[PDB]
Design a protein around this ligand. Structure first.
Ligand SMILES: Nc1ncnc2c1ncn2[C@@H]1O[C@H](COP(=O)(O)OP(=O)(O)OP(=O)(O)O)[C@@H](O)[C@H]1O
Ligand SMILES: Nc1ncnc2c1ncn2[C@@H]1O[C@H](COP(=O)(O)OP(=O)(O)O)[C@@H](O)[C@H]1O
Ligand SMILES: [Mg+2]
Ligand SMILES: [Mg+2]
Lengths: 20, 58, 406, 90, 361, 208, 48, 121
């Protein structure tokens, strides 16, 4: 699942792809 | 009767998947991680994250 | 800039009939308990419905408010403490408080209330607004004629730009208490024995007019005359709400007799049809000259009170007063009261000015209008400048309320 | 004509201030005209659509894409005598 | 599926939407060690000797938010074993709950558990949902508080709501006192749980208190025996209805208040005259403190005595009323029409915890 | 039928409820990915300084963490009606009037600053017990005269007040209001009779 | 407007719940009648 | 026309017997239930109509025609083209007027040679 590999991004912030 | 008149539950609306890398409407899913993505850079990032995860886990 | 800011303020509306309280931003008061409280000879106070309705020896029924103003500050402090501890369940020093006040509240009483709220309750902020202003604000009107018919007085209060025109206040003693007295007199004339529900152990169904077949509760303790009178007033108010109706036009014996009767069953099982007598009682609010009390008295009818109050204001503002008539108070919930008032006012209003009664004929919108307006006002972001801070009360002293709260 | 409050129609002597006006509105979901509506910002910034009752509400529900009452309503709308808003992307 | 979590002053009921009964029910209590780091539920009651037992929900109102957060965390992770960030959570609030408490619940759910969707419903309306009636009055009696909430067309009338502090915990303490008067030993803090069990098993509501008292004084046939956990057997009689009688006669506990029937009648009288007929015709009993046998008949006779003889009285007490609040919450969360009511994460991000007042009623 | 509807609170008791916006309306499942991809910003119960208040008291708000310490936006609304301020010397030199006491003028100006020149509210709040009775026209006349004099002394121009016209206007309005129902009925009957006479005259002119 | 919306939403939800329970009860009753008819059908087939 | 939401037969006692076939059709405007003749059950199974399928039914013949799965159920991950169609707009029941202009020579050519004989032609 996407949540297992990636941090969710805070609203109003540009996604960058930070992992767990 | 039940063959000719199956009481089919209405189909569930599909999950409108979103790319975890760019937060764009998902167009694809990677066969190996089953995670959706929307661009080639997203695919590269997902596969790098996956190899990181698989090295960390075992 | 944005929507109104909620600062967690409290809104208190302590009337003569019920004490309405709640948190700012809500569309309804979270509590409304009877203003009359039980007192045992500080003295032990029983304040809420759960405690008032149980008999107790040597317990008197008293009210902190007199003629719409607080007289006994000890009972007022008791009611405030009960409200906080039981219903608010929050520290008084943590929430700003916005309270309503009578349009005719004295300067000294306002100062004493401010002193009490700041010295005793240590509240962080305070504000005191008029009931008429809050009633107007609940309807989104910045100007208009408030018509309040509570338990103590029937008062018309002209409001302009959010300010009470004190010179235009006209008050009449005909209110819920007068209707209760009229119903008491009617029951006395009909030899109906008012048995409060607390005295009834059991009852059996009886035919109309048949003697009541009821069993009295045993081991009942002696009760003060005030508590018995309060219970009788409660049952009479229930009768008022359930039976009484205002005639759609000038009272006529024939027209009242033609209309169907309404059947009511008293707590002791006694039941009767009230015929046309149910219509005669509310007519006293409109035509007091026919009341058995004093035909030659000088009391003014509700429509006459309305027309008089507007007549005392600047004629430049009278179009706004007639163009926005706001009816409030529990006594206005009597059936067809709004329709009769509208008809009489349309007949008496000058044709050159538009008359419009706001359609608020519901129990919540009529009884709690002041609290609704208070919650609205306390929820406005622009209103956060109006709060009286504790530092302001410290520097400007007790007199600071005279200038901060218009 | 006798004057009236701003939040009242000019036909009733009012100023007819556009912030209080209710006009026919169509939504994207469902694609049906909801009738008379006015856009109002809520407390938390939530934009709300207030709705006003009208006796012809069923006709307004059937109304889209521009029998006697229906014919008169259609004639009035085709002549653009009624302001009927539709959403569009900016 | 949606998660329905009913936080009660004594017991928490949690489960998935659409289920007939809650998947997990455990005491709402948090244990901290005097000098994992915190044990919640039956795990805490098994370690009373080393843990500080504190109840965060008093009379249906949350007092310590850290303990409540720990209770919710334990529920989601251990009881239901589900991820809060994946499932919508439907919480319940007591009637007349402070506004700041509902705001805090919303904040905790969205910022600490990252729940996708949240809703807060008043427990009385959920009990009415389980009853399946449009207009009625709900008399919910739990562990720490008793409420009487009249509901017209599904909208609770906040002004007419009445709260009674008498509830199952006070009845447990009264049964303990009565048993001590009979000469049995139960004053110890652990024996309180045994009094609770004998209350749940043997207590019943008398239809006529004076007649039952006289009969039990004249004859022992109304007495029943109960076996203590250590093997000792005690016989209790006349007490079986003296304990439930405190619900109708709160003066037994020393609290000068009206009874549950009188409170219900007063709450009904606070409503409009027209809707009172529908309230009398639909009196719904919910909560654990109403599972005593014969309570429906006693309430019916008392309300009939108080109400007019021309009014039809009908007490609704389903056999599953102990979980009526959770059954109603599950029905509501399973409805398609309710799906538009969910507070979304974006609504909280754009409006803050006050969004609960804009959407929930 | 009506073309458009106007109302303040709501148009009628039969009004349909307002439509609130919300996600998940089409079901949670379809929006699962959208809601799960993000996380909410933290909200706080924080104290805020309101620069409109002169005391500096700190109230509390529900606001985002990033908004902490920002200036209160509603303080931009804080602006009073410009009313001149005069010293004892300036009053003695220019504003002296045998008809008005200085303390009375100061009271009038204090009320004007308190009620933002709402002269009807000033008249209602005017202390008729301590000072002499004043009509609203007297208050307006005094205020506008003092403002004009102070402007001319210091520095543009402002329109002059005409107390007599306002007095005549109010007197006429009161006379029109106090008239009996028969007198107003006679006025409307004369209006309709004149309109029918003019209509007949216009018809005769049209025929010619 | 919020008050009007909350009242209407409560009415909507409660009437939906009432219809849901009515439907469930009628479905149970219809199921019982269907089972009776099913047994009757099996008997009719054996008779044929 | 509309998206099918239910296909429940209406059982009855004959004076399992069905007396009607209720079809629920959904469009962007709303939803409508049709009390269709029971004989339509043959065409429903012939066309393989299922819940969530967009169909249209002509008033005269009463025969159903299926035009694909509603696009609200289409994912971006599955590959089909003809089997998906957008939800119909407008009311479920429609009255359409089609006007065609032809010449008598057009009819002559059409009736002279209609379009294995077709293969050879
Ligand atoms: N539905 C009703 N029908 C008739 N009378 C009613 C109704 N509801 C309330 N009343 C009466 O309204 C009266 C005034 O109640 P209300 O709540 O308006 O008073 P208040 O504003 O608290 O008091 P006051 O103005 O006297 O200080 C009470 O005497 C009550 O009996
Ligand atoms: N069979 C039963 N008979 C009587 N009381 C019961 C029974 N089962 C549980 N209870 C009581 O129910 C009470 C808890 O009720 P509940 O509604 O869960 O309160 P809350 O919701 O505040 O946790 C406990 O005091 C328990 O003793
Ligand atoms: Mg009042
Ligand atoms: Mg509980």
């Amino acid at each position: 699942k996407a949540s297992r590999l990636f941090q969710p991004v805070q609203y109003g912030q540009k996604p960058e792809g930070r992992t767990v | 009767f039940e063959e000719w008149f199956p009481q089919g539950r209405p189909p569930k609306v599909p999950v409108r998947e979103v790319c975890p890398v760019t937060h764009r409407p998902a167009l694809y899913r990677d066969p190996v991680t089953d995670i959706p993505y929307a661009t080639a850079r997203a695919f590269k990032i997902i596969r790098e994250a996956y190899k990181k995860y698989i090295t960390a886990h075992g | 800039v944005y929507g109104g800011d909620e600062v967690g303020a409290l809104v208190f509306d302590i009337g003569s009939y019920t004490v309405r309280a709640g948190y700012a931003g809500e569309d309804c008061p979270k509590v409304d308990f009877p203003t009359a409280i039980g007192m045992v000879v500080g003295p032990t106070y029983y304040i809420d419905t759960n405690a008032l309705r149980v008999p107790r020896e040597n317990m008197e029924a008293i009210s902190p408010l007199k003629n719409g103003m607080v007289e006994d500050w000890d009972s007022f402090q008791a009611i405030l403490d009960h409200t906080y501890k039981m219903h608010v369940k929050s520290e008084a020093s943590l929430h700003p408080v916005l309270m309503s006040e009578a349009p005719w509240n004295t300067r000294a009483k306002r100062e004493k209330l401010t002193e009490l709220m700041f010295e005793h309750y240590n509240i962080p902020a305070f504000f005191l607004c008029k009931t008429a202003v809050l009633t107007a604000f609940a309807n989104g009107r910045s100007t208009g004629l408030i018509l309040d018919s509570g338990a103590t007085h029937t008062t018309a209060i002209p409001v302009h730009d959010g300010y009470v025109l004190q010179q235009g206040i006209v008050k009449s003693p005909l209110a819920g208490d007068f209707i209760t007295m009229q119903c008491r007199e009617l029951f006395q004339e009909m030899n109906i024995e008012l048995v409060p529900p607390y005295m009834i152990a059991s009852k059996e169904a009886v035919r109309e007019g048949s003697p009541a077949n009821w069993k009295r509760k045993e081991k009942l303790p002696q009760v003060t005359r005030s508590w018995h009178n309060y219970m009788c007033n409660c049952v009479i108010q229930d009768f008022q709400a359930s039976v009484l109706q205002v005639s759609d036009s000038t009272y006529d014996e024939q027209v009242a007799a033609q209309m169907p009767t309404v059947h009511y069953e008293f707590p002791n099982g006694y039941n009767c049809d009230f015929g046309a007598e149910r219509l005669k009682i509310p007519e006293g609010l409109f035509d007091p000259s026919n009341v058995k009390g004093l035909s030659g008295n000088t009391m003014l009818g509700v429509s006459h009170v309305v027309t008089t109050s507007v007549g005392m204001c600047d004629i430049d503002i009278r179009p706004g007063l007639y163009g926005s008539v706001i009816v409030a108070g529990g006594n206005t919930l009597i059936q067809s009261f709004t329709d009769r008032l509208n008809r009489e006012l349309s007949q008496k209003t000058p044709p050159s000015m538009r008359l419009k009664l706001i359609a608020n004929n519901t129990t919540v919108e009529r009884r709690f209008s002041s609290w609704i307006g208070g919650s609205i006002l306390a929820s406005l972001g622009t209103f956060q400048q109006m709060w009286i801070s504790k530092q302001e009360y410290e520097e400007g002293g007790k007199q600071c309320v005279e200038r901060k709260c218009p | 004509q006798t004057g009236n409050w701003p939040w009242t129609s000019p036909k009733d002597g009012g100023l007819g201030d556009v912030r209080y006006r209710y006009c026919l509105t169509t939504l994207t979901v469902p694609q049906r005209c909801i009738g008379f509506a006015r856009r109002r910002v809520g407390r938390g910034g939530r934009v709300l659509l207030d709705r006003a009752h009208s006796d012809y509400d069923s006709v307004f529900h059937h109304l889209d894409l521009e029998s006697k009452d229906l014919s008169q309503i259609l004639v009035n709308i085709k002549s653009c005598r009624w302001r009927h808003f539709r959403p569009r992307t900016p | 599926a949606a998660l329905v979590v009913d936080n009660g002053s004594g017991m928490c009921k949690a489960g998935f939407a659409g289920d007939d009964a809650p998947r997990a029910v455990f005491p709402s209590i948090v244990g901290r060690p005097r000098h994992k780091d915190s044990y919640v539920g039956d795990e805490a009651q098994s370690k009373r000797g080393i843990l500080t037992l504190k109840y965060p929900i008093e009379h249906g109102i949350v007092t310590n938010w850290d303990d409540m957060e720990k209770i919710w965390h334990h529920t989601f992770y251990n009881e239901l074993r589900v991820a809060p960030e994946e499932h919508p959570v439907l919480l319940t609030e007591a009637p007349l709950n402070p506004k700041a408490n509902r705001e805090k619940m919303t904040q905790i759910m969205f910022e600490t558990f990252n729940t996708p969707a949240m809703y807060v419903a008043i427990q009385a309306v959920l009990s009415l949902y389980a009853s399946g009636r449009t207009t009625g009055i709900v008399m919910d009696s739990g562990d720490g508080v008793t409420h009487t909430v009249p509901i017209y067309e599904g909208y609770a009338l906040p002004h007419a709501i009445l709260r009674l502090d008498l509830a199952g915990r006070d009845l447990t303490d009264y049964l303990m006192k009565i048993l001590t008067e009979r000469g049995y030993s139960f004053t110890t803090t652990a024996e309180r749980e045994i009094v609770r069990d004998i209350k749940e098993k043997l207590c019943y509501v008398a239809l006529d208190f004076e007649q039952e008292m006289a009969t039990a004084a004249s004859s022992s046939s109304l007495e029943k025996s109960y076996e203590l956990p250590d093997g000792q057997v005690i016989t209790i009689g006349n007490e079986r209805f003296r304990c439930p009688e405190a619900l109708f006669q709160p003066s037994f506990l020393g609290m000068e208040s009206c009874g549950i029937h009188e409170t219900t009648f007063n709450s009904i009288m606070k409503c409009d005259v027209d809707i009172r007929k529908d309230l009398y015709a639909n009196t719904v009993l919910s909560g654990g403190t109403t599972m005593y046998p014969g309570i429906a008949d006693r309430m019916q006779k008392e309300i009939t005595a108080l109400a007019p003889s021309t009014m039809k009285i009908k007490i609704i007490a389903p056999p599953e009323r102990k979980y009526s609040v959770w059954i109603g919450g599950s029905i509501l969360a399973s409805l398609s029409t309710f799906q538009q009511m969910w507070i979304s994460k974006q609504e909280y991000d754009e409006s803050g915890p006050s969004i609960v007042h804009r959407k929930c009623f | 039928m009506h073309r458009e509807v106007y109302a303040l609170l709501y148009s009628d008791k039969k009004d349909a409820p307002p439509l609130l916006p919300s996600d998940t309306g089409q079901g949670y499942r379809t929006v699962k990915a959208k809601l799960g991809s993000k996380k909410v910003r933290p909200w706080k119960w924080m104290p805020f300084t309101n620069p409109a208040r002169k005391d500096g008291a700190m109230f509390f708000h529900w606001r985002r963490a990033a908004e902490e310490g920002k200036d209160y936006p509603f303080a931009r609304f804080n602006k009073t009606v410009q009313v001149p301020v005069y010293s004892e010397q300036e009053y003695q030199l220019y504003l002296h009037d045998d008809a008005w006491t200085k303390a009375e003028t100061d009271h009038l100006f204090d009320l004007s600053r308190r009620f933002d020149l709402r002269f009807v509210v000033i008249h209602d709040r005017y202390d008729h017990q301590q000072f002499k009775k004043r009509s609203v026209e007297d208050l307006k006349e005094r205020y506008y005269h003092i403002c004009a004099k102070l402007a001319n002394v210091r520095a543009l121009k402002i329109p002059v007040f005409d107390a007599g016209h306002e007095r005549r206007r109010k007197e006429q309005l009161e006379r029109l209001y106090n008239r009996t129902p028969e007198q107003v009925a006679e006025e409307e009957y004369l209006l309709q009779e004149l309109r029918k006479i003019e209509a007949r005259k216009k018809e005769r002119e049209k025929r010619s | 407007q919020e008050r009007r919306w909350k009242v209407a939403a409560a009415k909507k939800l409660v009437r939906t719940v009432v219809r849901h329970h009515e439907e469930k009860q009628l479905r149970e009753e219809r199921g019982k009648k269907e089972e009776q008819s099913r047994l009757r059908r099996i008997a009719a087939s054996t008779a044929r | 026309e509309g998206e099918v939401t239910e296909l429940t037969p209406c059982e009855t006692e004959n004076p399992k017997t069905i007396s009607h076939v209720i079809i629920g059709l959904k469009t962007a405007k709303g939803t409508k239930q049709l009390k269709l003749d029971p004989s339509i059950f043959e065409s429903l199974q012939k066309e393989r109509v299922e819940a969530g399928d967009v169909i249209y039914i002509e008033a005269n013949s009463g025969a159903v025609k299926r035009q694909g799965r509603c696009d609200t159920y289409a994912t971006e991950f599955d590959l089909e083209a003809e089997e998906y169609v957008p939800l119909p707009k407008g009311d479920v029941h429609k009255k359409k007027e089609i006007i065609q202009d032809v010449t008598l020579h057009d009819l002559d050519v059409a009736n002279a040679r209609p379009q294995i004989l077709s293969m050879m032609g």
